[PDB]
């Protein structure tokens with residue numbers, strides 16, 4: 663078995679079905695005590711929670727699902743009828759994520775799409791009936807943050823006030839993306855300093871609010 667299978671089994675055997683908080687706590691326990699994994703984690707997760715509560719987004723797009731930790735984190739704070747779409751290139755992880763969400767009782771709020779972000783983003787309007795996004799969580803791969811931001815804009819998926827929230831802007835780091843959004847009059851940016859999940863290593867999130875062309 664894989665690390666990701668082991669995380670899912672741990673949740674299944676140490677959390678309560680239908681209880682998102684118990685799922686997050688189980689994942690965080692496993693990943694602190696047993697095996698590190700690239701979940702956004704509790705420290706940065708608390709910042710994400712504060713952002714989600716401030717904006718109450720009706721439609722969120724996540725890039726990079728992994729085991730479903732961040733999807734659970736966000737979806738448990740969505741209002742009735744609000745929705746999360748999450749894109750995941752690795753089919754084994756897409757299946758873990760789906761099972762994680764099912765266990766948490768969040769499956770009605772989330773659509774887990776198996777494919778590359780750069781291939782799926784251009785299909786959101788016609789295939790997935792999206793108009794514009796209220797929030798984007800970028801947490802897939804550092805080198806895709808800038809290209810996928812520019813693709814989102816090309817595809818007409820951003821509106822005035824769309825919130826981009828980017829993980830790992832310090833470690834592994836996303837220098838092109840940061841230089842771009844911080845230098846562009848089309849974004850208003852704020853940095854939230856924190857720590858790499860499960861580690862005493864500095865990391866941070868960037869919030870970049872789209873301001874129109």
Ligand SMILES: Nc1ncnc2c1ncn2[C@@H]1O[C@H](CSCC[C@H](N)C(=O)O)[C@@H](O)[C@H]1O
Nearest residue numbers: 701702726728731732750751778779801802
């Ligand atoms: N181009 C791409 N499109 C979609 N998924 C991608 C991708 N490149 C990498 N990924 C996926 O992005 C994930 C990064 S880890 C995601 C962690 C998750 N957001 C959490 O905090 O719980 C991996 O599962 C990886 O397979």
Ligand SMILES: O=c1[nH]cnc2c(O)c(F)c(-c3ccc(F)cc3)cc12
Nearest residue numbers: 700701702726801802803830833834
């Ligand atoms: O590739 C990633 N995608 C999404 N999130 C990540 C993450 O949160 C990480 F900490 C890391 C990471 C991996 C190894 C390290 F030594 C440090 C950070 C990687 C990713």
Ligand SMILES: [Cl-]
Nearest residue numbers: 703704705860
């Ligand atoms: Cl943490």
Ligand SMILES: [Mg+2]
Nearest residue numbers: 702801829830
């Ligand atoms: Mg990350």
